[PDB]
Design a protein around this nucleic acid. Structure first.
Lengths: 312, 273
DNA sequence: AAGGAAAGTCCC
DNA sequence: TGGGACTTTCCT
């Protein structure tokens, strides 16, 4: 009857996928509220309680036509990328601890993808809502093993051929699906899946967290045009900018940008730029403004660092 | 019948390319090579001049010069070594078609294991030595050059290794460069913090060397001050004269302890007081 | 085709 | 757990 609730989604950025090579534990997929001195994990919840229930989650794709992503959500109850959690009774809120995303290679995409589609179609997981619109009957049928015959294999495998071509290995999305018990006591009732927001690999050169590590100087003349060195975290040469801004009382406008070129970003970790003119060059007492790394793309920004402008 | 390289291959600067890597991409640069004039390796057979075969191959750097793993694909180059007839009209025969296919550790055992199963060994080095640890960032070229005899038989002439050649990618075989610095001057008292942007360097193994006639010192800085091995934040070293009185433009360069290599020079004017 | 960066890998 | 640097690839 009821539904699922993404309660607390995943942090969406800052997480770094891992290849099988990294092996050992390397963390737990954070919650969109984790803040070190308090950390969480993507929590889900149902409403019209159904006593006990099984909620499986798989990684889908961030495309208009939600599909299965090759990466494997490896964790605890996970196996083949379908972490299955048994929503305890009365408490319809079971969270997903340290999950961890597994990064498939660009070569193992169709190879790994076959299995994902093969499976589910077997284990009764999501009705060709990810694979194709010709199935929909990958739930339970009644009893057996669901070998879907050697025929149907042609759609799956060929479906693994056009998806593996556009698949993006840099971003994923959780797909929470709930199963409520039935007459047999088994869990056959498919509750409309709810995809998560969208998680971006941090390993990717443009989804990583921006940070200003060092600046040889954090003060300049209101005139501006004073060279500065900013040591940073991997930033994409032609998609980064230095923003100077101020909390103006009459609203809160005024923003300035360092003047540099991609040719001034030393090997994705340093930026040499010139400082912008400050608003009131008529100032007699210096004013404290801010600096901030910002991605021209998504416009994500670093924690702002102080900068003090003094008169000419 | 005798031989000596006229144009010694390049030293520390080139970069080892791969198979997957851009093929037909580049070649092998010579000694006095240039950004406007190349000049590949050419061996001059002083005196004797006529028909002759040539099999060029790459070998390790040290004493028992075993055949090196890396191939050397390019024109006529086979199984790894090079081979083709030499102009039977001129003497000093050149080679513009050589590429150095560095191999992966993965396929190494195999790689050297080819050298033998394919007979490759300019110094008939024993097979029991044709294995074990090999250095992949340093190699030498050999010239197993054969010609005729005083009459008309297969008079093979003695091989000779070409100066060292090093992988540029290897962060400790690479060319130590100094791309740009913020400060350019400082007080004889020393201590002027400087930001030095530079090419990939290994913090555990790198120094900032200040030369200058009768003066020698290095910039103080710890490892934690080497950012993503492409920037260093060191403090300028005290000049010899605690009370200078005019610009004494000295020289500053990146130095690598291990290799004992020194980056190009960059000037740093030491002003007074 | 000399060089910059992304993808994939080891080892803290 | 969280994170640098190394190795192999891919894009100019």
């Amino acid at each position: 009857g009821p539904y699922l609730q993404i309660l607390e989604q995943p942090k969406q950025r800052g997480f770094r996928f891992r290849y099988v090579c990294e092996g050992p534990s390397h963390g737990g997929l954070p919650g969109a509220s984790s803040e070190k001195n308090k950390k969480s994990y993507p929590q889900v919840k149902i409403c019209n309680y159904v006593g006990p229930a099984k909620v499986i989650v798989q990684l889908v794709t961030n495309g208009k036509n939600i599909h299965l992503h090759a990466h494997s959500l490896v964790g605890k109850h996970c196996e083949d990328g379908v972490c299955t959690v048994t929503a305890g009774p009365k408490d319809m809120v079971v969270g997903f601890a340290n999950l961890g995303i597994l990064h498939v290679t660009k070569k193992k995409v169709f190879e790994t993808l076959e299995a994902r589609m093969t499976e589910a179609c077997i284990r009764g997981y999501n009705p060709g809502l990810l694979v194709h619109s010709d199935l929909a009957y990958l739930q339970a049928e009644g009893g057996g093993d669901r070998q879907l015959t050697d025929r149907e294999k042609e759609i799956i495998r060929q479906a693994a051929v056009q998806q593996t071509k556009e698949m993006d290995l840099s971003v994923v999305r959780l797909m929470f699906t709930a199963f409520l018990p039935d007459s047999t006591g088994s869990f056959t009732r498919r509750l409309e899946p709810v995809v998560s927001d969208a998680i971006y690999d941090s390993k990717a050169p443009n989804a990583s967290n921006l940070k200003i590590v060092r600046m040889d100087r954090t003060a300049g003349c209101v005139t501006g045009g004073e060279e500065i060195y900013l040591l940073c975290d991997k930033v994409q040469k032609d998609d980064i900018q230095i923003r100077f801004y101020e909390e103006e009382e009459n609203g809160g406008v005024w923003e300035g940008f360092g003047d540099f070129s991609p040719t001034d970003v030393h090997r994705q970790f340093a930026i040499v730029f010139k400082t912008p003119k400050y608003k009131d060059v008529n100032i007699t007492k210096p004013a404290s403004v801010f600096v901030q790394l910002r991605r021209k793309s998504d416009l994500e920004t670093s924690e702002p660092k102080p900068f003090l402008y003094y008169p000419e | 019948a005798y031989v000596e390289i006229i144009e010694q291959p390049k030293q520390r600067g080139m970069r080892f390319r791969y198979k997957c890597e851009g093929r037909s991409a580049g070649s092998i640069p010579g000694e006095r090579s240039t950004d406007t004039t190349k000049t590949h390796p050419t061996i001059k057979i002083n005196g004797y001049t006529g028909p002759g075969t040539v099999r060029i191959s790459l070998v390790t750097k040290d004493p028992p010069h075993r055949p090196h793993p890396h191939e050397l694909v390019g024109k006529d180059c086979r199984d790894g070594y090079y081979e083709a007839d030499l102009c039977p009209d001129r003497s000093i025969h050149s080679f513009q078609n050589l590429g150095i296919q560095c191999v992966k550790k993965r396929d190494l055992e195999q790689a050297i294991s080819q050298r033998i199963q394919t007979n490759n060994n300019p110094f008939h080095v024993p097979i029991e030595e044709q294995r074990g640890d090999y250095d992949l960032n340093a190699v030498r070229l050999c010239f197993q050059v054969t010609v005729r005899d005083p009459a008309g038989r297969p008079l093979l002439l003695t091989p000779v290794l070409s100066h060292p050649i090093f992988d540029n990618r290897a962060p400790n075989t690479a060319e130590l460069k100094i791309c740009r610095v913020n400060r350019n001057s400082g007080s004889c008292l020393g201590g002027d913090e400087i930001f030095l942007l530079c090419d990939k360097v290994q913090k555990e193994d790198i120094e900032v060397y200040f030369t200058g006639p009768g003066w020698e010192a290095r910039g103080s800085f710890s490892q934690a001050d080497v950012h993503r091995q492409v920037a260093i934040v060191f403090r300028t070293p005290p000049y010899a004269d605690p009370s200078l009185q005019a610009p004494v433009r000295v020289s500053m360069q990146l130095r690598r302890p291990s290799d004992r290599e020194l980056s190009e020079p960059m000037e740093f004017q030491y002003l007074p007081d």
